[PDB]
Design a binder for this molecule. Structure first.
Ligand code: NDP
Ligand code: NDP
Ligand code: 1CY
Ligand code: 1CY
Lengths: 516, 516
């Protein structure tokens, strides 16, 4: 359509490029915090060693063994790489990234005992002339992201130091620390977690997710040790968990005509950071992001024919798209799964006359989306940049009124912010989905106007919890939220409407398992 | 037929149960009101203070007439204490609580008949306690004619005012403490402590406390004043948001050079229960304008001359032959704004020619439909109306600032959520909280429901650059208790309601900002 469509700008890829890849950290220390006796660890512990081996090699989803197209990487200082017997070098099943200003990828290769091995481990060994940051940077490249599932900082006194301070600390998703109660090993380097509220912690609040019971090693000195997984507390996801909990403890009970019950409160707001490629996909329960992605893209394109979603295996619109339901809405003239002028149609053709989904609508009605894209690039402080699908005229003609019916954009310091207005909000499955959807829209719109993603604000109206969801939503409440993942684009397009779900990839999403 | 008919529960939805009052009292360093047998301390300054506060009216120009005067409530014992030759307290309605004395009884106790008749109007007895007295001053005879009620005494009455239900109605407490040389007392005055059950959620705070004064009564009596008020967290919601904006907002500049400090996304809640009217107290809100424009809105009016003809020129700038022409609205008579606000509320989508046309029946009447769903299916999650119509903004003098509102019904109370895109914290927001509270209250009256809560959601919240100094001044004032809204008479239809049908009682805002 070209002119009917919104042409992505040249900076399209400039304000969304992953600058630094997210990672985790594995480490062992003594009761005093020591980590290494200068070049060695005077305390090799069987259990801890197997743990490091398992943690760093295994992938999310059991039954999938590492391979060259999907594996984990480890980043280590040169002195650490040097402390590994050349015979066990490199650590198998992972991409070994070494920090060195004296050794090149080639040199590390030379170090391996024979040629054969040097060739057999060629794609598993690369040097980086820089510290952690330049390594995390190298990793974010198209070649390693999403290729490398998880990056693990396996250590080195200087790497751990770079990792625990801005900027690399803002990407540290988890800290796995093994504490061995050594009989005496007072080393040199102390590994310490910045305490909450101090300047060092840089605003981050590290809280345990899990702590193991004190254990006894099968080694020679029955050494005692324990494990701990530490994560950067997530206030953002907590807003959500707090609101669900309040609805369950204080919400009002209501049963509709169907006998469908719900607990609910009225009026609420949430904030979600969208900077540096941050996607707020909730962690205490996996979110259907492919479903989320396909539908948002479905929106911006002005679609109304749900079959396109159900063909790509997304069935969120079947119930409300059937013949039976449509007939109950008086839309007996609509093809099955032809919802009418809903969501997207009102976004790109407000007030246009609707007939059937396959008709030509180009140039019809007010294309709100195309004007907001144009105003942001010429008058970013305009206070009237908002779209609505809430059209009282077209409403009866719709399969049903839109739940997320209003959105507004704000600009400050080149950062695109978006406010959302959801009249009805199902906390259990609806709200998380909607948070992902609008987060995506702000990113895609940001990329189209030459701005950086900022924040997503969410205004809830009637936000409920189904009765049939109270218990499972209670189980979930137990879990403490983990760090959010990030989304990257593997390719850009010429027009906003051209983006496909595959063009982007969600990296480092470690959501808790399905509630039992 | 086009107008919204009021139900017969119209008056019951907002009947003023108890009228709001204040309490004046004197105590010694132990909290001794007196030895139950007359206050042993005549501290002249206190007497003139008492006389001044309880007699004068806010209108620093009106004299106490039976049509507009202050009331004074006291127990029989306190009324006896008043020298017969000085009964009743002149210039104030004397309200006496007694289970034996009668309106005629009190009267006869006064000597000469000349005053026994000139004061039949300023004396009245109530056979019951304080709670009954406030319920009696809430009748149409006293509210709003009585500008303010003053519980002036009796240990039994003070105790009642300090406990529910009467406390929830106490606007303030004036307490003078005397350095008592005589401890001859027995009953102690005590303001419930913050957080204790006795305080019933109310947190009493000092607005003012004087320095130690010395009476010219020849005894060197040391004494001091106090003005305690119920903490108004709700207005502090607004005071805080302004502080935050002024303190950390994004300074932007219009294309005309006009400056603003801003933040995007905020929310505020306001209780509309029991005739509570959330009119900020830190700066007087023009209620006569609010009320008239809202009414103007409900009627679906599009002609501002009708509002300017009532001393409300808020739309005179956008009603200019000049402004209008810029908008290309060349064929619009002056002051004809086009299909804005009200028009989209009652006629969404109708084609607009001139404010003269008859629109009855045209477009969608969002208000009607809500009022109906409200009385038959109060749980429906689609009770919201919008003024944001992209196909018709270009024909509007201006696009709506407060563009969307939704309703929610719980326990028979009506709540409302307002969405305002641009928000002038300096003048609009305060005005807009007023309007939508009024709107919510009237909607309740129209649907046999009780006013619940008003939720205010903001988009671009800003403080105009040249308002910093004034707002900073206002921020120094501790918010006072919100006033109450009442209704002298009712109506057969909602479009019929006139500004003079409701009265705003007990509104004691702080004086104008000394903007030198
Ligand atoms: N308890 C535990 O879990 C662990 C303990 N250890 C212990 O720690 C000690 C090793 O720590 P340490 O001596 O700090 O060694 P490291 O393993 O951190 O190696 C440091 C080396 O990494 C390189 N490097 C680091 N930062 C940069 C940078 N910004 N730019 C370029 N190169 C960089 C340099 O290589 P180059 O010299 O080539 O320029 C450098 O000398 C040992 O005693 C080991 O046993 C190690 C890992 C884990
Ligand atoms: N220092 C100060 O600031 C003040 C000092 N005082 C002094 O304190 C003393 C007040 O006496 P105290 O007994 O505490 O209180 P009151 O003066 O309130 O006298 C109580 C009397 O008020 C009436 N009353 C109270 N509650 C009810 C009710 N629910 N229904 C009907 N009638 C009711 C009764 O009249 P009845 O017996 O006829 O039924 C009752 O005996 C006085 O001596 C007065 O001078 C008073 C005010 C202020
Ligand atoms: C096994 C050990 C000591 N334990 C932990 N927790 N973390 C590490 N990074 N380790 C480690 C792994 C490999 C190398 Cl080369 C050095 C230390
Ligand atoms: C003047 C005095 C003592 N002082 C205060 N602060 N409050 C009262 N209510 N007073 C009072 C007024 C009238 C009567 Cl009859 C009794 C006490």
């Amino acid at each position: 359509m070209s002119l009917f469509k919104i042409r992505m700008p040249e900076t399209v890829a400039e304000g969304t490029r992953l600058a630094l890849r997210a990672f985790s950290l594995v480490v062992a220390v003594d009761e005093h915090g020591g980590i290494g006796d200068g070049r060695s660890i005077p305390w090799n512990v069987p259990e801890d060693m197997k743990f490091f081996r398992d943690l760093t090699t295994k992938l999310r989803g059991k039954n999938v063994k590492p391979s060259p197209a999907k594996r984990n990487a480890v980043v280590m200082g040169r002195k650490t790489w040097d402390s590994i017997p050349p015979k066990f070098r490199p650590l198998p099943g992972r991409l070994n990234v070494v920090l060195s200003s004296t050794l090149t990828t080639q040199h590390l290769l030379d170090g391996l005992p024979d040629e054969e091995k040097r060739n057999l481990h060629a794609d598993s060994i690369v040097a980086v002339n820089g510290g952690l940051e330049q390594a995390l940077r190298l990793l974010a490249s198209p070649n390693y992201t999403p290729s490398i599932e998880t990056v693990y900082c396996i250590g080195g006194g200087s790497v751990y130091a770079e990792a625990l301070r801005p900027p690399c600390v803002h990407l540290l998703q988890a800290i796995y620390r093994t504490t061995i109660r050594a009989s005496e090993s007072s080393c040199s380097v102390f590994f310490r977690v910045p305490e909450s509220g101090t300047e060092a912690a840089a605003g981050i609040e590290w809280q345990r997710e899990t702590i193991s019971e004190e254990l006894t090693s099968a080694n020679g000195n029955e050494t005692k040790y324990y494990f701990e997984k530490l994560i950067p507390r997530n206030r953002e996801e907590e807003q959500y968990l707090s609101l669900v909990d309040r609805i369950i403890r204080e919400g009002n009970v209501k049963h509709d005509r169907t006998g469908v019950g719900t607990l609910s409160i009225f009026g609420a707001q949430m904030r979600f950071s969208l900077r540096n490629n941050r996607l707020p996909l909730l962690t205490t329960k996996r979110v259907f992001w492919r479903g989320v992605c396909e539908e948002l893209l479905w929106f911006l394109r002005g679609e109304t024919y749900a079959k396109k979603l159900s063909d790509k295996g997304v069935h969120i619109w079947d119930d409300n798209g059937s013949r039976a339901f449509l007939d109950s809405r008086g839309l007996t003239e609509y093809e099955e799964m032809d919802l009418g002028p809903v969501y997207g149609f009102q976004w790109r053709h407000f007030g246009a006359a609707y007939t059937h989904h396959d008709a030509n609508y180009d140039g019809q009605g007010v294309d709100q989306i195309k004007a907001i894209v144009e105003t942001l690039k010429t008058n970013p402080d305009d206070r009237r940049m908002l779209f609505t699908a809430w059209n009282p005229s077209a409403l009866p003609r719709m399969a049903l009124p839109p739940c997320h019916l209003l959105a507004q954009f704000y600009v400050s310091n080149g950062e695109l912010s978006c406010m959302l207005y959801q009249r009805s909000c199902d906390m259990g499955l609806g709200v998380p989905f909607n948070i992902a959807s609008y987060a995506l829209l702000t990113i895609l719109i940001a990329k189209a106007t030459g701005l950086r993603p900022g924040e997503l604000v969410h205004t809830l109206g009637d936000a409920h919890v189904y009765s049939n969801h109270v218990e499972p939503c209670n189980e979930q409440l137990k879990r403490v939220p983990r760090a959010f993942p990030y989304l990257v684009f593997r390719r850009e397009r010429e027009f906003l409407e051209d983006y496909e779900e595959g063009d982007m990839e969600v990296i480092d999403y470690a959501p808790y398992p399905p509630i039992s």
